[PDB]
Protein backbone atom coordinates (compact mmCIF):
# COMPACT_ATOMS: atom_id res chain seq x y z
CA UNK A 1 0.00 0.00 0.00
CA UNK A 2 1.00 3.63 0.36
CA UNK A 3 3.51 4.82 2.96
CA UNK A 4 1.84 4.43 6.35
CA UNK A 5 1.26 0.88 7.57
CA UNK A 6 4.96 0.42 7.00
CA UNK A 7 5.69 3.13 9.57
CA UNK A 8 2.87 1.88 11.75
CA UNK A 9 4.23 -1.65 11.40
CA UNK A 10 7.54 -0.51 12.84
CA UNK A 11 5.36 1.48 15.24
CA UNK A 12 6.80 4.81 14.13
CA UNK A 13 3.85 7.05 13.09
CA UNK A 14 4.35 10.73 12.13
CA UNK A 15 7.00 9.66 9.65
CA UNK A 16 4.53 9.42 6.79
CA UNK A 17 4.20 13.17 6.42
CA UNK A 18 7.94 13.26 6.89
CA UNK A 19 8.48 10.88 3.99
CA UNK A 20 5.96 12.83 1.94
CA UNK A 21 7.64 16.08 2.97
CA UNK A 22 10.86 14.57 1.66
CA UNK A 23 8.97 13.50 -1.46
CA UNK A 24 9.55 9.94 -0.32
CA UNK A 25 7.00 7.40 -1.49
CA UNK A 26 6.70 3.68 -2.16
CA UNK A 27 8.42 2.32 0.92
CA UNK A 28 9.30 -0.71 -1.18
CA UNK A 29 11.07 1.30 -3.85
CA UNK A 30 12.77 3.19 -1.06
CA UNK A 31 13.79 0.00 0.72
CA UNK A 32 14.93 -1.22 -2.66
CA UNK A 33 16.58 2.06 -3.64
CA UNK A 34 17.55 4.25 -0.70
CA UNK A 35 19.34 2.77 2.30
CA UNK A 36 21.32 5.21 4.44
CA UNK A 37 21.36 6.94 7.81
CA UNK A 38 21.66 10.42 6.33
CA UNK A 39 18.47 9.73 4.42
CA UNK A 40 16.71 9.10 7.69
CA UNK A 41 18.04 12.48 8.71
CA UNK A 42 16.93 13.84 5.33
CA UNK A 43 13.36 12.86 6.12
CA UNK A 44 13.98 14.41 9.52
CA UNK A 45 14.18 11.12 11.43
CA UNK A 46 16.09 12.30 14.50
CA UNK A 47 15.82 9.55 17.13
CA UNK A 48 18.55 7.12 16.12
CA UNK A 49 16.39 4.34 17.51
CA UNK A 50 13.77 5.44 15.02
CA UNK A 51 16.43 5.87 12.36
CA UNK A 52 17.67 2.36 13.10
CA UNK A 53 14.09 1.11 13.13
CA UNK A 54 13.40 2.85 9.84
CA UNK A 55 16.65 1.44 8.48
CA UNK A 56 15.50 -1.96 9.63
CA UNK A 57 12.05 -1.07 8.36
CA UNK A 58 13.32 -0.66 4.81
CA UNK A 59 15.47 -3.75 5.28
CA UNK A 60 12.26 -5.54 6.18
CA UNK A 61 10.94 -4.63 2.74
CA UNK A 62 11.76 -7.40 0.19
CA UNK A 63 14.78 -6.73 -2.04
Curated annotation (Swiss-Prot):
Induction: Transcriptionally up-regulated in t(1:19) pre-B cell acute lymphocytic leukemia by the chimeric TCF3-PBX1. Not expressed in pre-B cell that lack this translocation. Isoform 3 nuclear translocation requires an NMDAR-dependent proteolytic cleavage. Signal peptide: none annotated. Residues 1-63 form the SAM domain. It is found in: Cytoplasm. Highly expressed in marrow from patients with pre-B ALL associated with the t(1;19) translocation. Strongly expressed in brain and testis. Expressed in fetal brain. Isoform 4 is highly expressed in brain (at protein level). Isoform 6 is expressed in brain and several cancer cell lines. Isoform 2 may participate in the regulation of nucleoplasmic coilin protein interactions in neuronal and transformed cells. Isoform 3 can regulate global protein synthesis by altering nucleolar numbers. Isoform 3 interacts with DLG4. Interacts with EPHA8. Isoform 2 interacts with COIL. Isoform 4 interacts with APP and EPHA8. Isoform 6 interacts with EPHA8. This is Ankyrin repeat and sterile alpha motif domain-containing protein 1B. It comes from Homo sapiens. The lineage of its organism: Eukaryota, Metazoa, Chordata, Craniata, Vertebrata. The chain holds residues 813 to 875 of 1248 of the full protein.
